[model samples]
Target: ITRKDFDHINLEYSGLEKVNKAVAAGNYDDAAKALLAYYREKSKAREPDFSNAEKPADIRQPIDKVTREMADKALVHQFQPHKGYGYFDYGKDINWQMWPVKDNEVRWQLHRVKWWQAMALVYHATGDEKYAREWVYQYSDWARKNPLGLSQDNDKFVWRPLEVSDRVQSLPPTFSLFVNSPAFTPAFLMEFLNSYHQQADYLSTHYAEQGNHRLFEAQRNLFAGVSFPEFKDSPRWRQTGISVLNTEIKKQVYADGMQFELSPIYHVAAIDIFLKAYGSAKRVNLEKEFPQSYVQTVENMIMALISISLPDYNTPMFGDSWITDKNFRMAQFASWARVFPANQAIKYFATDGKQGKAPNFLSKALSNAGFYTFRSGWDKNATVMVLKASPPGEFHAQPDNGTFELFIKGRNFTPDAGVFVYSGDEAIMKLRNWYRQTRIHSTLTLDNQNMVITKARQNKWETGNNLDVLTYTNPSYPNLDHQRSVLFINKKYFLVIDRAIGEATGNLGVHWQLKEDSNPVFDKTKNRVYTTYRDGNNLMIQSLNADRTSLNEEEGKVSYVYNKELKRPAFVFEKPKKNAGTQNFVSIVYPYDGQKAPEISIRENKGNDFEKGKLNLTLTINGKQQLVLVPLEHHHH
Candidate 1:
């Protein structure tokens, strides 16, 4: 740092005369020494207060067994954002630029230095100097190998905006944890403080072009400025940080509050990091720089979670979303409740029905974002169905439009065929491509090729006492426009119809995915299949138009978590559209509790143009009959 830099800082050291004299004499090295001595004594006394809670005085959430797991594999040097598996051993000398996994994300994410923070948490939780000392050694080793501009600007694996911002967010908290420990010596403090300042400065200038990644990096710049007011350049960092943050919020969020990425995981993640950044802006009294309506966008972002959440309160697997965090939605809602205490529906979920009024709507349609939910009620056992007829958005998007996931009686009967793995070798790419096919999801495909990821528009949406229906049409293929309309029948079952309203003269088909362990039984004679799961909840699917349609029980797939695929029974119904005529596929998606299957039959309109533009069916359980009449190609704005 320049000699003048120290003068702008909080210079409260006892040896001020020597530091001032050294600064005037242009001896910055000597001035920094006396400056470091006083900071050491004060940090050990917990005087600076760098806890990562909302209020710096408040203690952070206690780290759970994740710390112990990191400690267990501490020597192995495995760094992955998901669970374990991508462990690489660099033996004695560590390789900062190692690529054990072909996925650049695995290599790039390691530079985030989150593993260093995990080790610090283990040390503080168990009072073990081993974790802290190891961190001190490994941290310095990393610093020696990787500097701000060590790699090319375009090389995402190192020196990118993402990795730079992540370290700025994580590294300071770890330093706070080790400050009082014997392992934290004055020498280590000097190296760490100087290194951190450099990174924070680099981040203030370099940033992500446009993505949620930019939001995260911009947020770290603001936090660094707020956390260390002593630095002279921090004020500029704070100003630039909020400038991008406000502009991006307008561009990144849709009018209805879904993220532009359109991926469930990234949408919610953008909200979380932006929310934290908003709090940081408020801390430094720069809240007014943001528009007054900013909080509403965030509020609507939280409401999107409530709208699309399942009866289990877990998110449906859409785009590149993961399902391991079963309590993720619950925890997020609880935190948002504190932010919006007067919001009744948010309060209802925060207390889990003990307080606040339940939301009155059983179904919602986010037209601008192309996401809709049709459900029975809020009970855990209530039936619900979700459809994503959305525009393909962002890098994580899949080619699965007009796909739906049906939940009934505590089981996801019709599940989305998940994205098994991300970037890797040729074989990994092949596997990923297989999972991303339009036929893999419970949607339509032509000739087995992957459908173009196009935005589907809402054609018709209706909700009544007897039924709720959402209809959308996608220009999914070169020659065909696929229209799908789903009806919630009697609030217990669903009827979905598809019409390929174009001259696609190839094998036109739709695929359905049952649970991997549901043990599906296909009865081709009746054009039906039922799941014989031990959980006592069963699902039955029966096709209505069986004239030219053919049924095949192809191999199905699903992944509730990452890097794991479960065996599932796939039901594919197809028809040959040799000429310029429309091909219709109609079916009933019924999920019944217990082993008994319902008796179902097609009464009328088994074809798309059946009597007065309606498809008819009958479902009988215990001799109680319910006749359903669902709409065909009804057009509406």
Candidate 2:
């Protein structure tokens, strides 16, 4: 490379002018000395830091055994981030362009360089030249085989928006980790900088119009501009990224702080991606480029997470979000808690009330997002219930509205079945859609048809310490409207009333799911199904209109982790739909100890017309009676 080949060389870049003058005069050894001196002074700015960078679960680690194992696997040319397809071997030559597996997602995601980070971390921890050599060779192989304009095909996975952004953003920290290694030669640095510059340039020109793809496309330009400001077009990239991101936060994030995608996984993902850009800008003294509203919007999203959290700290697996572990949930809360110093509610979740103050309300609602949470308290043993009935925003959004999950007495009684894989063959997609069907969710479905994706309506949002009531409706099917109302009294139990209203004729049913680990008993005569855990943590779900609905155990499976599923017996409370324009399938969602449940009975409300548009009923629980009124139409206190 010639002195003129430095990508519009910074003529006034501090001591670089002296180095250029020496090399110009043909003082070759002095040029090396001057360049080393320059690096010794401005090393911090040139070599970016990635300590707080986002490394999600698949690639990021707190790891040694797993990290070592993954790094070792990479040394053998194997990549296995997605367990669904297992590992794809690149062979001895290491094919960087074409995929060995049929799943194209593996190829698209491979360009994100997940294995690069894994091997890079291992090199740092062990000072192992082998891992560093593998990384350098792989980088070279990828750069040599796959150029920028690879046939101009949409199937060019390496140059896609998401892959480009991830590769560009993650490279800063990855390079920083391996910068001091002996394998990192000066030639390699120049090669990496050239590739990084080209990647960021591609991002500046191309971007998607909507969804996470757009947000991801706009982010890494900020990272590149901040990480390598010496590039001639860095400022333009930086300004474009910051200006577009300033406009995007308001567009994709709902006013109620939920990501417009309306999925727990995507909501947090949107936050993670946005925060990474902000952190990079702040590191490079460009924090003020973003509006104050950007920071506030992120804070609002984090606060909503606190409200939506279960008593045990994890969130409901609504949409494509998987059921996560308890410790990871705690780690996520703690990570976000550091961002807000003054908000006690955010800190409360971060520490599980150990260090921060607990949230003041017993229940919370996100009206615009159509999500509600009812909890007895903020403890692992407390009862937590979450409901999802919102506008379908993106591909990640499930065909489930008016679905609810229950966590009580230390177990998730009813939970959402997870989405297994994103991209696959037709056979795999069929299985994936099986779990996404409306009838598989814990809600009302008509004729076993999938729901037409649409926004939902909230009629009333009322909650207090003693009583909590939520009334919402969704156009779940073409000729039917499913209105669900949940009433929790005395902070002990819940009365879930599901009313399917319309002239649509079919088998009107309520699908109920049990936790995969539970041992449930089906009592056909009593119209009750309950979990009988040996440890005394149990829940009894009894239908109030007992004879009106029949119980049938059906095929069911729940996937908590990616590519792994557990089979559990599922039940549906169903009855034939006649000319009655409205059908009510009300039930008592009660949680109690094993074999010790309250004897429940339901009757028409006292002197109230059941024929009218009202779910007026009296409940008798263990000889204690209470009148519950759920008016179909709007009514005031």
Candidate 3:
């Protein structure tokens, strides 16, 4: 729903309105001598106290300190000053509102320049004059209201914006005050840095060398290589930020190393603003003059963030925000890199682009753990189809087409709850609806309904029937079928499927139960498998084999024995019929792979247990086959 244009992605208020029209249109005589050395450089006008009052000094302590202490669950209690333009929170429920503008626009007074770049990084780490007068009264009240528009060298303000993606790139704490301020003009604040330096000179003329093809374009080429490094003479700005930050630091890191949105507090808010704009554009070395493009992509993105890490330090919540895997901190991404070294060697990291181009097919099909074919065939199968994308909104959350944790022999079948603490809890208002919800995902539901419906009596942003699919074959595990948690994966396994094909009206038929919670143990020879409720009580579904020889099985497991809650080992299969006129409602939880736990008779109290239509599943493993196909719907896109 956010089709760009949140103040054209507010790159520090459009680089202080493109350094006040490159010094009043003289087209930059050294940005007019750095716009008069930004008033003789008062430390380039600071900002960053996104105040939860104080606490961000860990410096890379990351051992998972309980999911980085959930970045200290803030929700911004008071200090309003434009509230990051419509809303922006530090905790309590973690917030960020912005949009549908108008109460006097320059993004409604630059939401006090995003709260003066978080009170200039908390008054440069808490020397705190109320965080430097809350960033000098929001830059002297946006230099006292000056508003008007456009001038980043005009075609009514730059090109390629002929129709939409609102273009505009330019980086840094908003190009450190439009190239270091000199009381910027272009009708002061309203034309708003001349329509954001004409959309950052049409997104630094589409940063070609290897980027801007779109979709999270390496954080907009790290905002056009740190807000317009004069279009870094198209070496495609450091070979497309070292080829999409070494293919998203190794396809969103998480063979266990983590960052595939398993949220170590949003992978340090997206690796500390993408290693502070690629360590401030490789500390001015500009990729060592592109010597065949020096390949270190921030030490291979800090070694694909330490082999997806997990000795118990966690970090594997694949895609979309918080899903546990604690201890996350590579030194808050080495404080935006000056020379580099918060902890290097994710294997000498070097995606080397050398400016030849072509490889962006989901960054070389995710450097290769596999699955993502694009242009469109949607053939994802990694041994058992897994594509559940969306999560860790970088700074936002929800949109969790969640679930899809599917794994077979290695175990772990359909799991991905990874986050559920809801600190502020208005019911947790809206982190996009924490993976849309029917009890936070795995897929298949009809009588369980609610796949993102609730057009709000007051939910604030309610809009549903939300089906979202992605398939650049596999941009990260691409295909993100919305209404939350579709999930897909490789390095071994993961798959969380979906089908709420809702057209709108009614008939939805819910019951997509494909769970995994285990952990408990009373000892049946210690059960086995991972340790057994069937070890990890695994499931490895593989679809389209529907012949189960005439179906109807009666092998049960519950009647009592749920005690702490798994409700007694289950398999309750008896829900498939529909065929004749296609009303749909089907079922298939065919788990196999060493495969055990299949016996039952239970009648004594008739308790049942699995909970919604009733269940108590348990599978052990060998080749681990799966086919949980519950069909039956009113509509789906």
Candidate 4:
């Protein structure tokens, strides 16, 4: 249908079939007025390409692959269309047929609802009648159900399977399902909205005010997308969104633009949600919907994309939690750069072709890694570096706490072990093992590995290390800390520096996992930051004289290797998986520029040195004019 016709369908005929019927039965002026009102409420009606077909003709990519069939798969229905209905565990090999209902947890059922949204999107994208019919059936089925049983709010449990931890995620795609498909129905929309509101209220009231407080606030404001105006002055949206964003922006977007979470997957997820929410808020004109503390959320987001990235446009698996095989997302990043022009670190490109200034200053400050640190910053595209000065929480298993990773060209040298989830699977032993220990990550290791699992109660500030070291503490924003990280654009390198003082002791390890085939090297400069040895096509993750067997391989790019001599165990690229680019290296190190290696230097003394307690280390990445440097400090009791 034409764009105008689509608007007429959504705004006028939307929840107003009766009104439209009456207008049609009456005069032309009545119909015209009805159309105008429709246009006004759905103001986005005039926004660029709101209703143009979901798929553009210029998508220009190849239709099918050589190995794949040439026939139109558009009409082919999913044999396993139940990805979101109630029992589809992804990333696992249970094959429901073999282990039927082995572990059908709440997460899976919740995923089923999400899957319905996916189905709906597929239907809309392909204009496939079968997909549309399936979507309608699933929506109707889900609308009448309670959690897990399909009976409609009969159970006390809620349907939003994602945690407040999922705040950085897109709204349950179900909302889009209702918006995109007419068969999903107005009733479905109302039900979905209420469910979202209900789940949000439950989260807001049930969380411990000072315990899961930040997450609680995050979840509340996330759903408060268009609904934020209602609480513009009520303290919840403004107070919560602003506070949480402020709290997270610094650490999440290191001074170097690398999210300290050390998770590329979560990083993208957060950006995607922020952009989606921005779109929703704009559509409704909810000016205060987002308490834009960091306008460069996108700027930092893009910077993180460019900074942490090697020439290949991929991040190393140095930290825990990442999606190992990154393809389309990388493409999306390139597409993002092409679509949006860069300003400072911010790239403001509208999905619908709109452009505006960043929401605030923090975004500008963090987008460019070495553009300006609390001390010094620079960006030349050649000497690029990304640094982290803190350690991941034991409570949450963030791997890159007090670590540094480097990238040169498009190849990722110092990488983080990306995460894969089978949350609802019962027989997945390896995944269970990986998520539980240091072996499957890029971090410190001594006496095997110190299991750093943070317990959630309340006390030293849940984000303690991050708050004190990784942030920029503003007098106006007192709670704000000058958390820092560095990314050198041209050097094709990244550095993570942590300022150290007081006691120090622990096994410091760096981890890198490669799902593909690529080369990596390690070279040490004595008291300086040791480098990963490398050359043209030959990069060796040579054992640092630590037993050859200490290195164990898990899921391909995700592995465990340690240097007992350095007293630091690390995960590095065993080989490259996908054809990312020609110039890339994967490695991680604790830089110690010409000094007496702190009270403890994991790279210097092993466990004995780490036992020294609080300490500092710098990381540097070198590629072309790209040079990145960072100093990292850490303290553990």
lDDT digits (tens) for residues 1-637 of candidate 4: 1222222132243434543564456543444444444333443343221111122112223332411121122123222323433333322221212223444444333432333434434444466656655555544444454443443433322334334323213343333433444454444444444444444554444444443345435534544533322222323543455455555665456654445454555566556534443443444454354555455564557655544543333444434344333455444543445324444223332221134442222212232222221111222122223333333333324433323344333334444444343344575646644555544443333323533432111111111211212321111111111122222222221232211111223222334443244422223322122333233322223222211223333343333222111112244322221222211112223222232222211232223221232223322223212122222223334
Candidate 1 vs. true structure, TM-score: 0.72
Q: Which TM-score value belongs to model 4? A: 0.44
Q: lDDT winner among the candidates? A: 2
* Cα lDDT, model 3, residue 146: 28
In the range 249-287, model 3's lDDT, one tens digit per residue, is 556654323355444345545455445445445544454
Can you give the lDDT of residue 524 in candidate 3? Answer: 24
Model 1, backbone clash pairs (residues 3+ apart or across chains), number: 1
lDDT of each: 0.73, 0.76, 0.32, 0.35
| Clashing residue pairs, backbone N/CA/C < 3 A, model 2 | none
Candidate 3 deviant stretches above 4 angstroms: 1-265, 279-285, 289-299, 302-379, 383-417, 424-637
C-alpha-based local distance difference test score of model 4: 0.35
Reference-based TM-score of each model: 0.72, 0.75, 0.26, 0.44
Q: What is the C-alpha lDDT profile of model 1 across 464-509, one tens digit per residue? A: 7678888788998878988888888778777888888787789887
